[PDB]
Write a protein that binds this DNA or RNA. Structure first.
Lengths: 386, 136, 62, 224
RNA sequence: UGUGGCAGUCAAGCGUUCAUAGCGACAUUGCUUUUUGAUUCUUCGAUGUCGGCUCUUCCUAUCAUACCGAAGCAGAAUUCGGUAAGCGUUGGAUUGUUCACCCACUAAUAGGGAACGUGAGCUGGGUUUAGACCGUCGUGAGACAGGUUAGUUUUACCCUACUGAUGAAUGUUACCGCAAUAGUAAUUGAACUUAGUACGAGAGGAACAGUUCAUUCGGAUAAUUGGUUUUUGCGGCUGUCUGAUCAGGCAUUGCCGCGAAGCUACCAUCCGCUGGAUUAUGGCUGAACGCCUCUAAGUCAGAAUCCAUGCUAGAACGCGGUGAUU
């Protein structure tokens, strides 16, 4: 017999196996294509997702029905502290793919990456990098030898960065060490850029800019063990089914005498790595800039942090990328934001957006006010001080 | 969308599957309409073709004149009562479903439309924009 | 960008928030939340609900 | 002249444009040949304004006005109202209209002298129409068709009405409006005549389906 | 394999002229196991038996989509053929139906397989025991190749398989990686513009590029909107019981109104990429055949095809760099 009503599948067999990720920091599989003429800059940046908010702006799209017209949209504020470089690592190319031949660390690493190298920081004698930071006691001849071995060799040069986690309202105190590749030309210039940026910080006024399309890489919000009707999207069976109605009913045919890899079963849902592409930066805001949530149309001084903070996160007092639409991974997750792999030209990209209004009401309920001064003005005085 | 419909209608919430009995809001004589299909719908296994505001349904008349009953005609849904999202921000919904008897080219069978008329169905269909009373 | 006013509770309505109920005699009702909307659907008189603005204008609070 | 024009292919221009004596309002999504039919026989005589009304492109049926005034519905935004107040000259008076009873272009059937309205519109809006447009407002329906806007094209010279209209109603409205009236069709027999075409003193633009015997009666009753 | 079903071979003629634009008799050669016969080899110390729902994967004898080539093809639409199965083939009335036939929709509503897929998946409407009724047959018990009505549908805790999850040992321990191999996904329409232009006696009437939306699918999130509500959070209400106010108990979450957080929905929102090599075919020089010919040597372009770019896991005995090494 055939299917008797030929219909599409459920799910996608290219996102298999749907298991848990390795770590919570999703790897970047591919950095953008190298261009050996550009000035040296990073290809990705490690931020922390805070949450969403609403944006009123002017859609200016010729030939569209909403031309010159105000639309509301959802964006995610991803918190972004500045990020400090602690080492470089260069890869030579083999007939078995790339291979890291040497890595060079900084002089005096902070207590956020020294805390990354111990599972139990409290018992430990904190003796990481003693005999390595004693290699700067000389003139650096071993370390200049290491950089010469990177200069002579090593087709691509990646830079070990790490976040500044104690500038973040998380309670982790441990920074996520990572590798980010460099696109600037003439790899001597790459490794001299990295040598000049040892222990120096990197802000997102340099990596990302306004209106740019960025990809976003993170680990999905996990949901535990999950049955098949919500994991894949299978129909519920009717009310009359003995032994339940929330299943795939026919697993397989008689022959093949096995369960195929393509049928839908139960297991993990969520906590997978994902990459969502084509997300447009609506804002790049700074930490020392008072009134981050101010707009050229709104002109009222207020930060982007809502009334009573972002829910389960806290208060943005840092840099922030503010990117259109949803992003994989929930709040408080290490989101790696990446430059776009390809030159995009679509007139959905290349659109220059200045915002008009940022929503900063409380997300802890059906919020009503924008700033507490506005609440004190509309509600009036209360049983407190006056 | 479709033939005779002018413009690219933005997607609103599908609120009227096949079987819904909406009010007929023009003075042709039908008291209520009955969806039997939706022009422009899709094909997917065990899924009712749902209409929306601005869509073009095929409709029969259950209450009304004898000349309109027992025959299949087109119609145009002009109120929804399922909350949809205009792009400027608001979610909105009318009180009760409505639609007007038409021909396949979009021309009206009646002369005047009672009740408010959603503006997604006034901009897409021009002839509804002529006979409409309260737009929005 | 216009900040509308609630038809039931007098609160201010920022864009992309609440609902909008066009009634059968074409009067437009703008609701801040589902609280005032689901009190309007119960035909509650706005002057008798003690947290609104039309209450505190009828009983002279302030 | 009587120029036949389509709006992207649509044979009804009165929905999509508002032609008066001192201005002409068009929708934003027009072709080259659509704007050409106005900018040819107008040229640099009256300002032709690309606008939307309340986010719509049905601005001939949303708004209603004449040489002296222009009326917009309640849902018209502030950018659209500012664009209309700027691009039009200072002779015409623009005022928003507060009524829950329709959109204005199907109610108000007006010219520089005498206006007809839908009879359900109220007195507080009737006074505002007679104030802003400066036009004596009466309350009559063409042969029971309550929407007198879309079923009666009107100018200062004459007027075209609903094609199934009694001769007694034609003579009554000719005694009222003080212009001659002839019932006819437009757009290959489409009976919605006030939305099928626009007209003023020196121009009348109709759809591409308006045949030559219909166009002859149009230019005969409008004396062009 | 007769028998269905399908494909060639020749060719009389039909088709305005005219066997071939397309038909294709008379013969004749085959294929298929999606029909039904024949056989009776396996199973009767029982491989649970029709239909539907559900869910995969495969084939192609292609309905649509892509790219081509022909007409009794000007355009438009239609008909046929080729490489093609990457992708999609619906909602219903009646009937237990398979099959059908209508009513719509649609880009189109193609044909099939996997023990006539799928009963320790379900339903049990059908056939098929026992009750019962009717018709005809029978002297009668009873029969039917008939109609109708009521009729217990059992078990997985094993092993494999699949879907997730750990895990010893390769000096210990931690961080950063590489990458074999395996999977891979996007699909189709509409509108504007092109343009009432090309083509046309008229009637009518396109396409390439650009733009905006949508259909189906997929992956994510939850600011907003909607749902949920044991935050029993606040309020209200009835019956009874703590002597009454207050504060409460009980009504197997007592009921009702609102309800954050969490979870969630094409009932919400965002996102879903680009190069190389080819098939059919169209060619370039160019012989074979001192002309000719895309083909033989060589070479240019080319499809929803294939392959990488991208995306998902990562070899738990595939590998590298680096910190510390009592």
């Amino acid at each position: 017999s055939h299917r008797k009503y030929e219909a599409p599948r459920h799910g996608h067999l290219g996102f298999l196996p749907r298991k848990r990720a390795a770590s919570i920091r999703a790897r970047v599989k591919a950095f953008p294509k190298d261009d050996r003429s550009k000035p040296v800059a990073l290809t990705s940046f490690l931020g922390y997702k805070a949450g969403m908010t609403t944006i009123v702006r002017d859609l200016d799209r010729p030939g569209s029905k909403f031309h010159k017209r105000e639309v509301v949209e959802a964006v995610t504020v991803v918190d972004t502290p500045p990020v400090v470089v602690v080492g470089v690592v260069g890869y030579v190319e083999t007939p078995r793919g790339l291979r890291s031949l040497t890595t060079v660390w900084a002089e005096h690493l902070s207590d956020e990456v020294k805390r990354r190298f111990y599972k139990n920081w409290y018992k430990s004698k904190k003796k990481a990098f003693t005999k390595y930071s004693a290699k700067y006691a000389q003139d650096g001849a071993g370390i200049e030898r290491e950089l010469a071995r990177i200069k002579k060799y090593a087709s691509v040069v990646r830079v070990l960065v790490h976040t500044q986690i104690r500038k973040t309202p998380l309670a982790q105190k441990k920074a996520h060490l990572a590798e980010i590749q460099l696109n600037g030309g003439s790899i001597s210039e790459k490794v001299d850029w990295a040598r000049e940026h040892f222990e120096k910080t990197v802000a997102v006024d340099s990596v990302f800019e306004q209106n740019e399309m960025i990809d976003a890489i993170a680990v999905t919000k996990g949901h535990g063990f999950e049955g098949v009707t919500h994991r894949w999207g299978t129909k519920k069976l009717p009310r009359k089914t003995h032994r339940g109605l929330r299943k795939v009913a026919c697993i397989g045919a008689w022959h093949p005498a096995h369960v195929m890899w393509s049928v839908a079963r139960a297991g993990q849902r969520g906590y997978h790595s994902r990459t969502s592409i084509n997300h447009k930066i609506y804002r790049v805001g700074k930490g020392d800039d008072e009134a981050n949530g101010a707009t050229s149309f709104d002109r009222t001084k207020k930060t982007i942090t809502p009334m009573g903070g972002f829910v389960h996160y806290g208060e943005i007092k840092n840099d922030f990328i503010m990117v259109k639409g949803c992003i994989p991974g929930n709040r408080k997750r290490i989101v790696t934001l990446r430059k776009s792999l390809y030159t995009n030209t679509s007139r959905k990209a290349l659109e220059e957006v200045s915002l008009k209004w940022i929503d900063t009401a409380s997300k802890f309920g059906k919020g009503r006010f924008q700033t507490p001064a506005e609440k004190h003005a509309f509600m009036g005085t209360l049983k407190k001080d006056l | 969308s479709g033939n005779g419909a002018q413009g690219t209608k933005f997607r609103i919430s599908l609120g009227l599957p096949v079987g819904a009995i909406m009010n007929c809001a023009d003075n042709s004589g039908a008291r209520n309409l009955y969806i039997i299909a939706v022009k422009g719908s899709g094909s997917r296994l065990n899924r009712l073709p749902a209409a929306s505001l601005g869509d073009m349904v095929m409709a029969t008349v259950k209450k009304g004149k004898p000349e309109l009953r027992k025959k299949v005609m087109p119609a145009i849904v002009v109120r929804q009562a399922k909350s949809w999202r205009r792009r400027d921000g608001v979610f909105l919904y009318f009180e009760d479903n409505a639609g007007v008897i038409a021909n396949p080219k979009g021309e009206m069978k009646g002369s005047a439309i009672t009740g408010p008329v959603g503006k997604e169905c006034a901009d897409l269909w021009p002839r509804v924009a002529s006979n409409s009373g309260v737009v929005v | 960008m216009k900040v509308e006013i609630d038809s039931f509770s007098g609160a201010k309505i920022y864009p992309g928030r609440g609902t909008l109920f066009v009634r059968g005699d074409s009067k437009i009702f703008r609701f801040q939340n589902s609280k005032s909307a689901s009190l309007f659907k119960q035909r509650k008189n706005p002057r008798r609900i003690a947290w609104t603005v039309l209450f505190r204008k009828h009983h002279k609070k302030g | 002249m009587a120029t036949r024009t389509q709006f992207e292919n649509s044979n009804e221009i009165g929905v999509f444009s508002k032609l008066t004596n001192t201005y002409c309002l068009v929708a934003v999504g027009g072709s080259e040949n659509f704007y050409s039919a106005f900018e040819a026989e107008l040229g640099d005589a009256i300002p032709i304004v690309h606008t939307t009304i309340a986010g719509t492109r049905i601005i001939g049926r949303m708004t209603a006005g004449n040489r002296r005034g222009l009326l917009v519905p309640t849902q018209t935004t502030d950018q659209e109202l500012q664009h209309l107040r700027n691009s039009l000259p200072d002779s015409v008076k623009i005022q928003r209209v507060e009524e829950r009873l329709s959109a204005l272009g199907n109610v108000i059937c007006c010219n520089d002298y005498v206006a007809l309205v839908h009879p359900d519109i109220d007195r507080e809006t009737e006074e505002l129409i007679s104030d802003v447009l400066g036009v004596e407002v009466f309350r009559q329906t063409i042969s029971g068709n309550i929407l007198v806007g879309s079923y009666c094209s009107l100018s200062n010279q004459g007027g075209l009405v609903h094609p199934q209209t009694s001769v007694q109603d034609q003579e009554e409205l000719s005694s009222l409006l003080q212009v001659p009236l002839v019932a006819g069709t437009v757009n290959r027999g489409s009976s919605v005549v006030g939305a099928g075409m626009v007209v003023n003193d020196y121009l009348a633009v109709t759809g591409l389906d308006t045949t030559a015997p219909e166009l002859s009666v149009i230019e005969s009753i409008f004396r062009l």
